[PDB]
Amino acid sequence: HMASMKKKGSVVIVGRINLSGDTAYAQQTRGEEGCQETSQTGRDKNQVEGEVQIVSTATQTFLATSINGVLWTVYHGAGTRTIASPKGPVTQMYTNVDKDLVGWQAPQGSRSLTPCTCGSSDLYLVTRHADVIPVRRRGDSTGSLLSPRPLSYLKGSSGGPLLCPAGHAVGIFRAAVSTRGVAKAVQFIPVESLETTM
């Protein structure tokens, strides 16, 4: 009944993929209890750094990527949820269930990737475990893994970036194509789609 109706919590940043130095590695910035409390209140006072954030809801964890001052991620992970921030929950700035894309204003402290203009097809996918996976671009929104991996290896990496050799953002990881549980290809939201959305 109306009085007992629950509210979904915010998406909470719980870590980041560190790409600054010469070694890529995952960092956790908040443990599961803090995350649950932060999800409920929407108030997150933690310092944010970097381009690729690890994010969580009460029930899922995945990635979020800053491009042109927007923190982008997938609708199948974030739904229409707000994101926790120092001043309380922040409403989505973009929502597109047809592209499986959402965006909030990028948190203070984050760094944004620049949209690729190279027209290059040698890409790199960054996972939540900070693996940097070579991907050959195969079409507007697909790319093949040079070395196939079991699905398990990509799970929880949606929202992560595909980058060009110059470190520009080419797309946001959306879905994996598999045969017998082995991922051969990936689907992503092309950065131009984002630029249009904006």
156 is catalytic: yes
Residue 132 contact partner, candidates Zn ion, ligand TSV, none, CB within 5 to 8 A by sort of partner? none
Q: Is 159 a catalytic residue?
A: no
The least distance separating Zn ion from the CB of residue 164, rounded to whole angstroms, comes to 3
List the catalytic residue out of 77, 85, 100, 110.
100
The correct pick among 58, 97, 118, 151 for binding Zn ion (CB under 5 A) is 118
Are the CB atoms for 116 and 167 separated by under 8 Å? no
Q: Which of 83, 11, 72 is nearest to 195 (CA)?
A: 72
User: Tokens 């290809």 correspond to what residue?
Assistant: 185
Spot the catalytic one: 44, 110, 158, 171.
Answer: 158
Residue 116 annotated as part of some ligand binding site: yes
The answer to whether residue 145 forms part of the interface with Zn ion (CB under 5 A) is no
Locate 80 and state its tokens: 């229409």
User: How near is the Cβ of 109 to Zn ion at its closest, in Å?
Assistant: 25
Count the alpha carbons within 13 Å of 35 in the hemisphere toward its beta carbon. 18
| Part of the chain binding Zn ion (CB under 5 A), chosen from 85-93, 118-126, 148-156, 172-180 | 118-126
58 belongs to the binding site for Zn ion (CB under 5 A): no
Binding footprint of ligand TSV on the chain (CB under 6 A): 60, 62, 74, 76-77, 100, 151, 154-158, 173-177, 187
CA-based angle 61:16:196, to the nearest 5? 80
189 close to 140: Cβ distance less than 8 angstroms: no
Q: Which residues partner with 71 through β-bridges? A: 66, 104
Report how far residue 117's alpha carbon sits from residue 17's, in angstroms, rounded to the nearest whole number. 24
| Residue choice 168, 177, 178, 193 for contact with Zn ion (CB under 5 A) | 168
- Which one of Zn ion, ligand TSV, none is in contact with 174 (Cβ closer than 5 to 8 A by kind)? ligand TSV
Cβ proximity of 48 and 18 under 8 Å: no
Q: Does residue 44 have an active-site annotation?
A: no
The verdict on whether 100 is a catalytic residue reads yes
Residue pair 136/122 in contact by the 8 Å Cβ criterion: yes
Among 15, 143, 156, 159, the active-site one is 156
How far, in Å, CA of 191 to CA of 184, rounded?
Answer: 22
Residue list, annotated binding site: 116, 118, 164, 168
Applying CB under 5 A, the residues found at the interface with Zn ion are: 116, 118, 164, 166, 168
- Residues classed as catalytic: 76, 100, 156, 158
